[PDB]
Symmetry: D2
Subunit: 115 residues, 4 copies
């Protein structure tokens, strides 16, 4: 995955219906506030979401939600843990918890269309 | 904005409560499908969202939704147009339309907490 | 629609990809705070959403988002105005504005899976 | 809660950061398809969401997401089980699972603004 690699993300866990992607907030991931850009944290969660969902077969995202709980400073290590919430014949939904220092710093919810 | 620059995004319009950010889907923005990664398109929309929201004063994102309508291939030019939907004293909501070739390819909805 | 009827909702306008549903905040629509229950406002928006999407053929709702901006008191007349944002072969997305006395009370965003 | 009462909903469990609300899909809860109206299921989840969040002090809902997985028929007994995902100084987020006959019917995600 080009974008994943470009962001320095690594797959730490992969299994049917699940995946964990980890990354560090680098200097090129900060925003106007000096903290982790919302797009970086989303990209992280979305990547885990893409991996987990596609273990069930080709799937494309339809709708995703991202809830942010605490701004992260440069150097933070973040992990996105994707778990399967629902698996239908044409769609599937996953929950992705974004964790840093053992606490949930963001919550991602996404649904895909199964090809 | 470091992440914005790292993704090759440019601000094309800025005004009270609004902003337009544009970018091109580069080789480092593709995903496992060979099309624009969901995180790239979100980062684009989120950047316009951040700019528009912060014209009203310091604001941080609370919850955002991204709805994807068509996968984009390498080289696509994309524009994220942010408009203010609601402005309250402690929160504000924006709609961000992602357009390519004159058509809406994604819809972003986000709410911020005003600092 | 039984639930619509039960809540006293009326279809004011219905055309390709759009619909307007109206209702009044009744005594049986209030929450403890004494204002319009979030579920009532959602039911109103969801009803317009359903009618607008049906104009394109049978479909089932997948994911919906409701953003609340202002509280409504008992007796308020309110409307849900749905418009089509995207129509694809397999899904469709609509925006629904909940309005009362000329003010935007809430914003509903929803996607359906076309059957 | 008037609206809760009107829909026949019952509070089964209420503890710090969590709540369980139960109800039955009645004749006045159906849509045209003859299945549980999306607004009824949302009202159920929203009610548990409200009760769970109130355990932390007064708060108003900002943004909520509802993901529908399975249709429910008339007479079905259903429950909304809310759990706290995040508690911050100014906001809080909850996950609410809508269950019937041991199956996950829908997933509700909501954030409140703490007063
Ligand atoms: Cl959402
Ligand atoms: Mg009644």
């Amino acid at each position: 995955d080009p974008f994943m690699e470009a962001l320095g993300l690594k797959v730490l866990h992969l299994a049917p219906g699940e995946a964990v992607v980890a990354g560090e907030v680098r200097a090129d991931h900060l925003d106007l506030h000096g903290t982790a850009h919302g797009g970086f944290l989303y990209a992280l969660a979305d990547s885990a979401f893409a991996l987990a969902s596609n273990t069930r077969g080709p799937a494309v995202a339809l709708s995703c939600r991202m809830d942010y709980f605490r701004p992260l400073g440069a150097g933070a290590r973040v992990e996105a843990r994707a778990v399967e919430v629902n698996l239908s014949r044409r769609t599937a939904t996953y929950r992705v918890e974004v964790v840093s220092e053992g606490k949930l710093v963001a919550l991602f919810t996404g649904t895909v269309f199964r090809l």
